[PDB]
Amino acid sequence: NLEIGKSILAAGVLTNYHDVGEGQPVILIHGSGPGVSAYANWRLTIPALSKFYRVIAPDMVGFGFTDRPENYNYSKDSWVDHIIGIMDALEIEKAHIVGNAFGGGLAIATALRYSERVDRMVLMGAAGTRFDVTEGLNAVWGYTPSIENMRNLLDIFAYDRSLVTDELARLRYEASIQPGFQESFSSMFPEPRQRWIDALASSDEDIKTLPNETLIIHGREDQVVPLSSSLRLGELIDRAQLHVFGRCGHWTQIEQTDRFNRLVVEFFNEAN
Amino acid sequence: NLEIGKSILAAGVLTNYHDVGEGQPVILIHGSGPGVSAYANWRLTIPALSKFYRVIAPDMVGFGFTDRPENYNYSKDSWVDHIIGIMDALEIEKAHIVGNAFGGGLAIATALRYSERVDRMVLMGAAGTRFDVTEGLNAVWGYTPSIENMRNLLDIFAYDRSLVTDELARLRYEASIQPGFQESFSSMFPEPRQRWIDALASSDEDIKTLPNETLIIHGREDQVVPLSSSLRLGELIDRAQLHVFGRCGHWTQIEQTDRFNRLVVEFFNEAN
Numbered sequence: 424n425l426e427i428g429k430s431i432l433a434a435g436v437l438t439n440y441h442d443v444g445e446g447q448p449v450i451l452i453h454g455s456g457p458g459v460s461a462y463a464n465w466r467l468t469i470p471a472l473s474k475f476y477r478v479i480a481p482d483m484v485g486f487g488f489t490d491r492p493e494n495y496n497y498s499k500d501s502w503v504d505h506i507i508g509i510m511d512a513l514e515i516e517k518a519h520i521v522g523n524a525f526g527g528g529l530a531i532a533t534a535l536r537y538s539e540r541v542d543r544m545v546l547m548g549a550a551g552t553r554f555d556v557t558e559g560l561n562a563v564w565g566y567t568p569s570i571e572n573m574r575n576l577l578d579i580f581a582y583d584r585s586l587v588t589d590e591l592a593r594l595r596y597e598a599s600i601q602p603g604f605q606e607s608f609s610s611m612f613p614e615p616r617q618r619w620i621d622a623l624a625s626s627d628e629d630i631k632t633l634p635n636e637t638l639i640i641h642g643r644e645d646q647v648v649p650l651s652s653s654l655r656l657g658e659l660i661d662r663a664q665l666h667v668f669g670r671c672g673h674w675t676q677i678e679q680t681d682r683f684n685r686l687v688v689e690f691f692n693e694a695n
Numbered sequence: 696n697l698e699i700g701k702s703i704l705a706a707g708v709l710t711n712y713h714d715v716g717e718g719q720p721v722i723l724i725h726g727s728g729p730g731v732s733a734y735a736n737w738r739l740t741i742p743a744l745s746k747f748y749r750v751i752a753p754d755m756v757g758f759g760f761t762d763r764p765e766n767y768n769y770s771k772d773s774w775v776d777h778i779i780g781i782m783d784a785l786e787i788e789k790a791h792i793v794g795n796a797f798g799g800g801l802a803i804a805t806a807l808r809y810s811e812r813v814d815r816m817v818l819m820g821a822a823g824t825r826f827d828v829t830e831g832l833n834a835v836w837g838y839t840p841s842i843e844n845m846r847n848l849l850d851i852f853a854y855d856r857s858l859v860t861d862e863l864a865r866l867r868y869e870a871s872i873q874p875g876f877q878e879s880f881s882s883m884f885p886e887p888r889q890r891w892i893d894a895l896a897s898s899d900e901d902i903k904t905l906p907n908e909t910l911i912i913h914g915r916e917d918q919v920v921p922l923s924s925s926l927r928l929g930e931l932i933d934r935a936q937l938h939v940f941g942r943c944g945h946w947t948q949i950e951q952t953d954r955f956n957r958l959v960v961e962f963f964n965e966a967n
Contacts, residue, residue, distance in 0.1 A: 657941065
């Protein structure tokens with residue numbers, strides 16, 4: 424299983440993670456869909472970035488192959504603590520961070536609490552402030568196992584559905600039913616789900632204090648997180664750039680791979 | 696005067712233009728400010744692009760050092776005819792086009808009337824549809840000669856005013872008073888100026904038919920053309936990408952030079 428990488432104790436949690444490349448560190452933080460893992464989200468990104476940077480992609484606690492501690496208290500602050508715990512464990516003092524949706528919200532929260540630990544940020548299909556839960560997001564977080572549900576979920580993420588094959592649907596369905604996966608997932612963002620968008624979000628006031636050079640990326644046809652959320656992030660963050668891909672759904676790193684990889688590598692390259 | 700390049704008869708008009716580089720042709724179309732010329736607008740762009748493409752930057756009729764024919768009938772269609780006349784004169788059958796504001800509106804109009812002559816488009820700080828005239832634009836089009844007026848105008852275009860020196864103000868002021876310049880300029884977009892935004896614009900319906908791969912660029916703090924206009928272009932054009940620079944005024948090619956040049960060159964490079 425290529426989704427399984429190495430193991431490390433981070434913030435007291437046995438964490439699964441991938442570590443590829445050398446040089447300036449870059450932390451990639453995956454989204455919050457069923458069966459998600461750092462590898463599943465970044466398999467097409469790591470190769471390109473690792474040629475210029477040291478890429479770290481961990482499975483956030485409660486997701487992927489990282490341990491799911493009994494009675495663990497999941498929260499924005501706990502996840503931020505995990506991220507920092509991972510960086511501490513790997514002696515990564517300061518790093519660039521790329522966050523996908525859920526991971527983007529965590530990136531912002533980490534930058535606010537640990538400003539000194541974050542350099543440049545890439546927020547993809549994310550939201551910094553609250554937005555009204557979408558049908559797409561409620562479907563994602565309200566997922567229950569079945570190949571048809573996974574196919575429909577994958578279709579929600581993609582602009583070009585021809586990319587969603589029965590094979591892919593089967594593979595991610597199988598990923599979603601691994602021991603304990605659906606258990607923790609279903610208990611992660613229970614109804615009413617607007618609560619979790621509200622809890623993961625950061626205040627407009629706090630976001631405006633971010634000094635980080637930021638690159639906000641979003642797919643015009645994103646059915647999960649509305650484009651309006653990234654537009655808002657772009658109005659709030661001072662040193663920000665916004666890049667919207669037309670004919671692109673939620674997973675821009677997948678549907679606009681080469682364009683995404685070039686923008687990100689060059690964005691980090693500026694830091695010299 | 697480096698603003699003077701070569702001369703060529705195009706659409707019956709003696710046209711001043713710059714031609715640098717070899718390979719795939721790229722036409723750069725300047726904006727409509729006082730004293731504007733292809734060189735003034737693209738001096739920091741041509742060098743970079745010319746390393747990979749053949750760059751053509753002409754002074755549109757009524758602007759720069761191109762002839763200002765007596766009783767010439769200036770209009771969107773006449774300007775489109777000039778652009779095509781320039782391409783015809785240079786045996787340029789199909790080309791990518793980069794348009795700055797006024798020039799961006801012309802790029803869209805040309806692509807609609809001569810779809811076969813345009814490949815990829817870069818619309819910078821432009822508007823495809825109508826928007827309510829801004830204080831900034833009315834100030835630009837309502838310019839009358841003076842170093843203070845030019846300094847204030849340059850300040851309207853820039854985010855970082857420290858880039859606007861008295862020397863630059865003097866140079867562009869002098870450019871604006873060259874024989875016949877202010878004469879044609881003042882008669883170009885007379886009050887009420889909303890009429891010209893309306894005349895240069897293309898319908899939503901027409902814009903939606905554009906098949907061209909397009910890159911829309913805009914500065915968040917643009918005081919001349921509102922960011923909302925580019926957001927709208929991004930909603931209408933199918934194969935579009937939008938890139939907004941934070942801490943950047945109207946002239947992104949000037950304040951975010953390297954970022955702009957890289958995005959554009961790579962965007963055209965995709966066409967192989």
